Amino acid sequence: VLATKVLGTVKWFNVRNGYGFINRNDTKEDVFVHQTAIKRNNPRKFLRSVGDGETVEFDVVEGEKGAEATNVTGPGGVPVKGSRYAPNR
RNA sequence: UCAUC
């Protein structure tokens, strides 16, 4: 873990490919986010996702190809909103 | 991992 409970804005997230990027609000740098790194998914949606432009809170770790987000939630640990491309329950 | 579901 390189940083804990960092706030960020999802740059974009591709539901079909299962990944995207988050822009850190502190450093304004992008970090990779994989679908499996989402800790609190939207219980009202199917599939694992975050939605473009959403505010998220996460840890930062060193990944294979640059820094990565893990333990992704909404701010204060609440569920994420998820992607418009992820179907609703 | 910069995609364009």
Asked whether residue A32's C-beta has any atom of DNA/RNA strand B within 7 A, the reply is yes
Which residue has the closest alpha carbon to B3 C1'? A14
Domains (ranges, CATH) in chain A?
Answer: 1-73 (2.40.50.140)
CB-CB contact of A34 with A54 (8 Å): no
| Nearest to A63, CA basis, from A38, A40, A35, A34 | A34
Which residue has the closest alpha carbon to B5 C1'? A16
Asked whether residue A61's C-beta has any atom of DNA/RNA strand B within 7 A, the reply is no
User: The dihedral of CA A26, A27, A30, A34: what is its sign?
Assistant: negative
| Nearest to A16, CA basis, from A35, A30, A40 | A35
Half-sphere exposure of A77 (CA within 13 A, CB side): 1
Experimental technique: X-ray
- Torsion angle of the four alpha carbons A11, A17, A19, A20, in this order, in degrees rounded to the nearest 10: -10
